[PDB]
Ligand binder design. Structure first.
Ligand SMILES: Nc1ncnc2c1ncn2[C@@H]1O[C@H](COP(=O)(O)O)[C@@H](O)[C@H]1O
Ligand SMILES: Nc1ncnc2c1ncn2[C@@H]1O[C@H](COP(=O)(O)O)[C@@H](O)[C@H]1O
Ligand SMILES: CCCCCCCCCCCCC/C=C\[C@H](O)[C@H](N)CO
Ligand SMILES: CCCCCCCCCCCCC/C=C\[C@H](O)[C@H](N)CO
Ligand SMILES: [Cl-]
Ligand SMILES: [K+]
Ligand SMILES: [K+]
Ligand SMILES: [K+]
Ligand code: NA
Ligand code: NA
Lengths: 297, 245, 48, 97, 49, 245, 297
């Protein structure tokens, strides 16, 4: 029981997030209302105070004499699902015959979509994102040819044994999900749920994954978010003997059922490395085009 | 009546006679974690007044050539007062913050500082200049503590993103002819209900001159920028011995 | 970690050393997710 | 509940059964350390002996509280008080009681 | 010795808060665990063998 | 059903299977300070679980020739955990305590310890032996910290009063053939509503063998006495920088 | 507002001191009831467990066959006011003519009643005491003679100027209370209220009055409670010339309206110094008489 007044009257524990704003339906662009001349003292829409941190509240109607316009222009194409639910390339896997990289007929790809700039720049507009996804696998030879070859794709979550050869016992796939498909078949396609241990994936994590001294050698771990590490994607030609053909698997991802939070400035310098915002210090370029003088076009 | 203000929390009070309203980040006030969002089962500790109060941590000098600085939260406070102690003894922490940046001059000085809060402010390096070396920033640059850290390349926020768009984040400006402070309230931002005050900085505070400081010879040339902040709705859990990192 | 709070005490005639057996399990709020294959595969060559 | 091999050190076939129990004996009264182990149920170590640990291996993620029940098997005439501690993340192995 | 597992819960061993746990138990059903195709046989049909 | 017990507070639990009930000092439970008894005006901080929990501070060895020891409260805890930090950062403190003294042996050992709580336990000196020198006890004897201090003259409690009458204070006995612990709950005792945790010890805990420890050659000879205690209803006020004394 | 359950259901702030016992009226000693033989299993009043910390609950009735006795013996003389409201000596002040001590005709006495063992031992039975008091001043020459001499007694609270001579300006006593009386008059007598800044005086204070390092030289301050320091009692012969007679003032104190808390063991070693429990280590005596053997009277 509580008896001293400061305890009774305290707000310690209020779990309700007091919100100053709320969403309104806006299926179309706003309309324009008729306006006329205003010759007044006291009323001054045009004057603002940007220091406050808010954007100007002045509208067309108050700055010029406007007509009435019934705007039926839709806002549907700018929803998160509209912007993001379009398949883009997020991974390429090579399976050569005579090669330096994967001459053994299998390959392991750590799932990380930050290797391609188009897709990456788009998702990095937000800090946190939660979504489901549709993955499509397009396979062919390096010339774009289709050959009668059978492949196995397996999803290996963190902790499951990664295959170490085309004949690894792990390909028994008694629990992991695998897809068996021919290059001659249409691209394989599957749905993936939101799998992070967190409520969202986060393209930016200002911190370290572990405790301890963060000495120079363990600085490559700054920014590493295990909550974003979903595992490995493994592929192999299905046989006990080497395949007769060199292959390429291109991975496309289409997000769906998207939610995003905390928008941020968009990347303006070329990307250099996966999941790390390093930029070339000697080649810092302006965000856009430049001109010779401010008084000339 | 919008230019004048008083912020009182704990045993501390701040006054200003040249304010520019108050920004409440993303439109919401700090709040404690709900029983449905929570996951850890131990009863949390909510010290209240001993930790939710204003702490004045640092003063920088604004010079005609300053590039700008940043601080990381809650890093700036992990070694200060009762808040720090709690952050060290507990694995889990969560809180909001009221940030009040101060800077006064005269009706004859000029300049404008952009004061903004950027969640998950991951720092990048110049990659050996040529961009061929995959270097990483050292602990002292990622978690600079109370002293903060000076920006090497403000135009790209030392992270390859344009400062020209930083206004998409909660912010205010300190434009000397207008105001002498910026006040921003920030709720707890993260993809988890609680986290480590040591391993993870939820956001960074940036103070960057966009319109350079200027004045005529003879006017006071020392123009300080002081940082004062107060945790709000602090909660801690997962108690054990104190740890500094 | 397990520590001696006081001491293991015994009278004359009883063993100076004894053993503790530890039994572990999960509480009722325990759940698991994202079904995967185990880290071990208990076979070396083909099983005949 | 299944048996947790806190004493996962002996490896020769003839001593495997010793992994199933660990000892206590008269000390010097200096609050000495008896044993330590990580509480991670799906990590290599003591938990691998438990059915929980094994089942855990078929899942990528888990959530929940755990419990370890310790049974003393000394003689009826033996007495004692032990302090068993759980150190949440971030705390290094305690140097003393 | 009785043969049963401990009945002690978090609530009785430490001071706990209230937590509304909505974590699902669906993936640990027998059909969830077992209804996943795995390899159970290989048959060879060579030419010269 | 009076011999068995469990004490759970904070993230700590104590069990005993050879108890002798529980003593509640002067018949009353610890409570927070009322708005009518209080005098200081600042809102107090009541950390709760982070400080009201069991702390195991020391172990002494009971020998056939031991004289007995004492500890001072809250001195024993001023440098331990979140409680200590609070006691150092605040001028004012107040709290109750649950004290649990542990000592087990065998059905073949014997002896009896008197465990008592004496409020305002002022220590005296032997006055130069002859009683002509007005000496005073040193800081380390008046506030011995967690290590406690051994009694020089138990019969007069090193203060010129008879230990034979110490039972007029809240106490229990640990008589080996009967129990292996003593549990005493103590409310806040003082003539002021709050006080300094550093300058004033509200009471002392005495553990004194009255019937000497004994056993036959061959039985475990190391018989420890361990002290565990938990603050209850801790309140702090008058916040400033940390001070150790 | 409070919303998370642990906050709603918490007892943080309960100001009500839960009490396990309560006082009953007991104006007389308890009576004795008739009892008879009991030959029973299960019932065992005689057996106790002193380890618990409580005193035995066994009564006459359950240990022997008793008769009925109506006890009308009163308990009135053992109340705190009965025990303490009896005037005892607490101070002696000398005002000699030709002397080493006070040859100047005035004297200052720091109010401390721990200089006399009878009174001291009684009040030290408790830790805290709150009360009002009646002070009586008995003055005469060293032979017990009464002379036609006028005196002034002044109460000087902490902070008021202590007189430094028989002619000090402080004797103007415009605010402090003074008593002017002749030795030929009956003893002066006044009532004093409870004056501590604390709720009670405390004969024991386990602590230091100030913060800082408590080095050997400031160890004489261990146990010093300013809350018990009420000031100075000053006395002077009222004249500009030395008095013709040597005087002695004996101060008696009678407490009234007494309340006491926390009883403690009673002093069993001789006192040596005022407000300090030091005892002679070389002369530690038993609390009482001793004998040659435990089997002999
Ligand atoms: N930010 C916006 N973007 C597009 N349409 C809007 C917006 N705000 C309001 N509207 C439209 O204008 C109407 C509300 O006008 P009002 O009540 O003055 O806010 C609604 O029926 C909406 O369809
Ligand atoms: N501790 C005591 N000392 C003296 N008389 C007592 C005491 N306790 C109870 N009595 C008397 O006995 C009566 C109560 O008997 P009972 O109801 O058995 O407690 C009252 O009328 C009291 O006058
Ligand atoms: C049968 C084959 C199925 C293939 C399974 C694909 C699972 C992919 C899950 C989507 C994960 C989203 C991307 C997450 C994190 C980022 O790529 C980086 N780690 C950021 O550091
Ligand atoms: C006109 C003369 C009036 C005389 C005034 C007498 C005031 C005396 C007040 C009673 C104080 C009670 C005793 C208090 C403390 C003890 O003597 C010691 N200081 C204990 O250390
Ligand atoms: Cl694990
Ligand atoms: K419209
Ligand atoms: K549930
Ligand atoms: K009676
Ligand atoms: Na305007
Ligand atoms: Na009995």
């Amino acid at each position: 029981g509580d008896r001293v007044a400061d305890v009774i009257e305290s707000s310690i524990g209020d779990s309700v997030s007091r919100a100053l704003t709320h969403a309104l339906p806006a299926p179309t662009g706003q309309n324009t209302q008729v306006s006329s001349h205003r010759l007044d003292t006291g009323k001054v829409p045009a004057l603002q105070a940007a220091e406050i941190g808010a954007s100007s509240n002045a509208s067309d109607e108050s700055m010029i004499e406007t007509r009435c316009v019934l705007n039926s222009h839709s806002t549907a194409e700018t929803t998160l699902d509209s912007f993001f639910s379009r398949a883009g390339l997020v991974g390429e896997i090579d399976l050569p015959l005579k090669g330096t990289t994967n001459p053994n007929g299998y390959a392991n790809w750590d799932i990380d979509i930050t290797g391609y700039a188009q897709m990456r720049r788009k998702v990095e507009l937000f800090t946190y994102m939660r979504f489901d996804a549709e993955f499509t696998f397009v396979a062919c030879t390096p010339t774009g040819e289709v050959v009668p070859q059978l492949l196995q794709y397996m999803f290996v979550p963190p902790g499951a044994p990664k295959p170490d050869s085309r004949e690894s016992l792990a390909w028994q796939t008694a629990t992991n999900p695998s897809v068996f498909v021919k290059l001659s078949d249409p691209p394989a396609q599957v749905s993936v749920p939101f799998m992070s241990p967190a409520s969202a994936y986060q393209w930016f994590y200002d911190g370290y994954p572990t405790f301890g001294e963060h000495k120079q050698e363990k600085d490559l771990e700054y920014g590493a978010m295990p909550n974003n590490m979903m595992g490995t994607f493994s592929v192999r030609t299905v046989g006990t003997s080497k395949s007769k053909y060199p292959l390429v698997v291109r991975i496309y991802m289409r997000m769906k059922h998207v939610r995003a939070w905390i928008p941020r400035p968009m990347r303006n310098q070329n990307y250099l490395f996966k999941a790390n915002p390093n930029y070339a210090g000697n080649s810092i370029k302006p965000t856009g085009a430049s001109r010779t003088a401010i008084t000339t076009l | 009546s919008d230019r004048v203000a008083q912020l009182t929390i704990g045993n501390s009070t701040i006054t200003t006679q040249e304010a520019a309203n108050i920004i409440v980040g993303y439109g919401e006030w700090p709040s404690y974690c709900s029983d449905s969002d929570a996951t850890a089962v131990d009863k949390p500790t909510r010290p209240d007044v001993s930790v939710n109060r204003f702490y004045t941590l640092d003063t920088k000098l604004w010079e005609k050539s300053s590039k700008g600085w940043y601080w990381k939260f809650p890093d700036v406070l992990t070694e200060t007062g009762v808040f720090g102690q709690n952050a060290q003894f507990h694995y889990l922490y969560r809180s909001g913050f009221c940030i009040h940046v101060q800077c006064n001059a005269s009706k004859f000085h000029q300049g404008a500082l952009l004061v903004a809060v950027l969640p998950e402010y991951v720092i990048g390096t110049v990659a050996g200049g040529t961009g061929t070396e995959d270097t990483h920033p050292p602990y002292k640059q990622t978690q600079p503590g109370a002293d903060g850290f000076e920006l090497q390349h403000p135009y790209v926020l030392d992270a390859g993103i344009p400062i020209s768009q930083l206004t998409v984040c909660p912010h205010q400006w300190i434009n000397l002819r207008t105001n002498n402070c910026a006040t921003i309230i920030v709720p707890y931002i993260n993809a988890l209900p609680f986290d480590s005050a040591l391993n993870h900085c939820n956001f960074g505070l940036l103070v960057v001159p966009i319109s350079p400081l200027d004045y005529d010879q003879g006017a006071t040339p020392v123009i300080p920028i002081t940082i004062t902040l107060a945790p709000m709705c602090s909660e801690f859990a997962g108690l054990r011995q104190a740890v500094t990192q | 970690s397990i520590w001696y709070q006081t001491n293991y005490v015994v009278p004359i005639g009883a063993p100076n050393t004894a053993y503790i057996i530890a039994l572990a399990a999960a509480q009722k709020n325990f759940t698991m997710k994202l079904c995967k294959d185990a880290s071990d595969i208990l076979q070396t060559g083909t099983i005949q | 509940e299944t048996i947790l091999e806190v004493n996962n050190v002996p490896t020769n076939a003839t001593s495997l059964m010793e992994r199933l129990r660990f000892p206590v004996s008269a000390q010097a009264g200096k609050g000495e350390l008896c044993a330590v182990f990580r509480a991670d149920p799906g990590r290599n170590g003591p938990w691998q002996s438990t059915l929980l640990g094994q089942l855990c291996g078929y899942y990528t993620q888990w959530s929940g509280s755990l419990e370890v029940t310790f049974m003393f098997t000394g003689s009826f005439m033996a007495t004692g008080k032990m302090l068993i501690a759980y150190t949440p993340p971030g705390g290094p192995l305690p140097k003393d009681r």
